[PDB]
């Protein structure tokens, strides 16, 4: 059966040597994958000159709304994704993670793109960097979306999630993607890509797909392209030394195998609740997805006195794990994805048995069954620091070794001895042990969960990588980072430090810069609607002379009887020399100067960005405020009944009769729009 | 004369096939470089187990003070640095950049480490990531310094700067450095390293040096190491495919050669001042450091009607450039560093003349002169779209080709056709032309200077990369990034997303976050000195009932008669339902509640970090404020007369009778220390 | 108390002054008729003010 490949806008299929997909729980082959004879140059050409300018013509708010629309359209027809993911040998609780984690990743990236990203093609990530004395030469960093493809080469673990956690920063980062899933489970990936394409939500060329080998794709990539690998270590190391990647110097992000540790602390005793949640976390993480996730615990570090207790409790919890078909009742663990993957697991199990020990059903696994089943294996290593095969070989299933430590000093060394892991766990109640664990073990782990009784109530666990937490790890785990919230959309952008005058940076950034030109046009800025405010619309307010009565009335009304405002003696011996006006009264009288009293588009304030009181304001000191608009960033009007509005940021520059800036700050404001869209 | 190499704490020199350093302006050999037989494994071992725990045991404030002390000690004996840099063929104004820009980079990284870095071994960059509805499970991203070495492989351009712009993020990031300078000018680098080592400021093992080939250094690097490269593309692309670098997956940052542009716009007419500063910028950037800097302008893009005017004004300005000895007066341009570099520049010119043209003294360069003199060269390309040799080959000296454009659409394509550049320039006075230039040309340039009449007064120019702006560029420019302010110290750290309860994350981060345990100890927190404050020292203030009279008195005193506070009619027609308390009065009454009136260690306030008003405060709605300490971060007391102090941050949490958090924010506050240090 | 107040300022009478010297600023005594009212739009406290407004261009 043809499992096609969405290339050049059409659904094409290969003609050549074809691998085939087995049904994981039964054994029959009901797909076959190939991509031979497909023009990858034409696919990259169609992507770059069709879907890349269509994404680069959208703003970040529009692209986040596109992410939310694809998230809702893919959450609607989600049951066919469960039907296609049941072929992967996963249970309902595993396919639920696989589908809903990717769709919630789309919703989370839609929220983060709708909140902290501008209504612009470009994104200035800085505030401003002044580089001169008078203020005529400054700079700020810009992030422009790259003009090429984003070749995502995924693994066989999460088709839906692992494709779809890379696709939301790619689309939000303004690049079109070409997804090469692993050929073991690409049918769910083509179900996802077909549900994306047959909706009219994304532009044509913004997403592509290849089932099978790429062949000629990596030999054609321009320097504006990125490659994000996920899978085995050897394949990613062979793709890193690919000559076009090292010649054109494209960013190559790799995610490889890892030995994720779970360290038990000395404070944990078996009567504590920490022991039960420790055993529950290890068993749940090792039995979720049958150990076929990269964030699965594969090493358990215990104290020396707690070897027998943990080695009995883990077996007593794991013998109640039923390994069978997901559709029949009473079954917790599903199966692996292939019989070849079962042989690849057991050939690593036999390496771990050549220098370790055995606690449970290990190499006892039928290599000719009608299903890719593998029993939950708990190993043991009596000499952990004298066995290098434990800290260098992963069995990519339900296998995890157990090994002792000595008083939380050998435990840190066994956590760091994995050559750089993808994730880690410490289970303690003592916070000093957690401090000493993060101070040494976070050099090798990209993520560390510290699990106690208070954390374990609403924790996501260890096998749910959050879309706003960095999914990475140095060394053996690949070195590259993913899912860093807005850190992940910056890999798909080019960072440029743009220099020049502030009045030029204000028009480059489409956001007002501290020393830019103004547009005063005789009417009040809060009277303007959203569509007629421009970044640069300034108001020069009238003056208000600060006096001693102002200090007295504000110190009475607020209750702030601070000695630098309400004491003649103590303020004379302070740094100011005499009693000064309150900073919050400078703020309040500033807002009394620029805020229009009448009813207009200004709805609520709710915000103040960065307040720094530079020089003190005294009695007999006039105050004049320069209210100027800075940033517009409309909202997408999530319901048809809600009022159309945007969150307009005003930069506020207060000064005195000597024209030096006292208390320059920035406020946010929800300003209603004149015309809606949805 | 022996030019040694600081390895394993001792000054050592190799014994083998030695390369030798020629004098640039005269021609004799007065240094020799070799590193054969030097144990590189013992050097890396001494660095990792002697200087890495010494640097990692310091805090970021102490490492910034160390950078400032090294900057002062290296600025004191700065004249011997000019004496050693005069041997590189540079003039006094050309060596002034190389010495003082690196020393100012040290002062700038000292200021950035003093202002925005904590008083901790670790650095949390996030605020808080809530991952649970109850609040008992949250996360934030840490940044722990790596436990390995940084291998810096520099070019021959800036010994002092190019070593010293990488050495400040390495030390401030927390790693020991091993610097491999280019063997054409390593004597200035060893003068720098010797002035660093013979001062007692840096720890032993924190800096190393190899004047010669590394040989066996890259084959011994652990996964906790980073490699930074600057030089030719053919060397760095072969050091990217090195098997230990791709096996252990260590970060290789490369800065290759780039084709930097200087685009002239259509608005610039020769009667404007923009034309003269355009010509002056091109001439100064092409003649500074004899055109041997990585950010030098090498492609001048002009309109077709302005070819003759630019191509005559550049000749009339560049024939005034005198190329001779730097010590004799009336000499603008110095010389190249070697006769081999002169032959390289002449053969790249001979490659460019296979399809280009000639305007000035080009390929005529005397190879038999006693000095590496190369004349200023202005080339011409009448068909820039039909000549790939212009857009693929740089002559690394005073050579810069000229080529026409067609009405700002061909100019953007010729600026982007460089394959990814390190620096760029548009000289216009129209902000929309600059917006259109950044919208397309920032994808290939890591830095773009928009130069006009206002910017050209106090600009640093185009060949001084700022220590707080990204010195990088995609594709042909290498792909990596440097000097990005505090972005550069994150290349030497590991980003670990740490999960847990907030009371555990507060002890990990040494900062109270949002929902941690409190420590109320019967006395007011503003009465405590700096050393007796702890992150988590809380204060539950008394209550204050908000009323209609509070709204009236604050709207009168501030002068803010906003309709949601002072109108009964329009507030009923608004989103609030009735008129509410001013948010600034909630802020002011909060500060009236928590600020102690007496004279204490609190000096000034001057700060407010992130104010958000969540729920509205009504009349008859009580207000209770939870002041708690968040972040301590002492200052170094730069003099002896100044008072010892620290910038203590307080997270302020206001709430009503329903205990919902209205108006949660964070203030900065200067708190005097009990005992000083300097 | 609770009775809102809205004010209707409107220009009523202009009547410039002749600028008896050359050093004196050109001005006129502009009368405004103030019509204060409430949420029921009944005119509580209607009155009229005189107010001196400087002219743009003089005569003497």
Numbering used by the authors:
A (entry chain B), B (entry chain A): 2 to 679
C (entry chain C): 620 to 679
Task: Show the paper's wording.
PaaZ is a fusion of N-terminal aldehyde dehydrogenase domain and C-terminal hydratase domain in a single polypeptide. The PaaZ structure containing six monomers can be described as a tri-lobed architecture.
The first of the PaaZ cryoEM maps did not have any bound ligand, which is defined here as the substrate-free structure. The map has an overall nominal resolution of 2.9 Å allowing the tracing of the complete polypeptide chain and assignment of residues after three-fold averaging. The model consists of residues 2-679 with the loop regions less well defined. The side chain density for some of the negatively charged residues are poor and the acidic residues were built using the best rotamer that does not create steric overlaps with the nearby residues. Several densities that could correspond to water or ions are observed but have not been modeled. The hydratase domain from three-dimers forms an inner core that holds the whole structure together, where each arm or module consists of a domain swapped dimer of PaaZ monomer and the dehydrogenase domain within the dimer is closer to the adjacent hydratase monomer. Three short helices (residues 449–459) from each monomer of the hydratase domain form two layers at this inner core. Another helix from each monomer lies perpendicular and wraps around these short helices, forming a tightknit unit. The distance between the active sites as measured from the side chains of C295 (active site of aldehyde dehydrogenase) and D561 (active site of hydratase), either from the same monomer or different monomers within a dimer, is symmetric and ~51 Å. In fact, 3D classification of cryoEM data of both substrate-free and ligand bound PaaZ reveals that more than 85% of the particles classify into one single class ruling out any large domain movement.
